[PDB]
């Protein structure tokens, strides 16, 4: 389940980060990257606690 959590949008335009990067300008990338960062950080904290 930890690994499978990586392939989720969490609300951004797309899941894979390296496709967000080449697809939005730097003034717009951080918002999507932030959505991914918060989601993945939450998933990792959950796994560590369990």
């Amino acid at each position: 389940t930890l690994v499978k959590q990586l392939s989720s949008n969490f609300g951004a335009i797309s899941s894979v980060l390296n496709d967000i990067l080449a697809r939005l300008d730097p003034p717009e990338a951080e918002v999507q990257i932030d959505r991914l960062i918060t989601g993945r950080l939450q998933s990792l904290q959950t796994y560590v606690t369990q």
Binding site: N18, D19, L21, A22
Partner: protein, 49 residues
């Protein structure tokens, strides 16, 4: 633009390079923005994939 990963046709106007195997490179196929080592494999495909 209908953005997907299925076989694309409308590609940008940039020339291509050659390929180097067995060495860690950052390939750019028709999309596919990744990084790894390119080794000739044996997985027998089907005429469309």
């Amino acid at each position: 633009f209908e953005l997907l990963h299925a076989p694309a046709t409308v590609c940008g106007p940039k020339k291509s390079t050659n390929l180097v195997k067995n060495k860690c490179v950052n390939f750019n196929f028709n999309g596919l923005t990744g990084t790894g080592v390119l080794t000739e494999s044996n997985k027998k495909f089907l005429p469309f994939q």
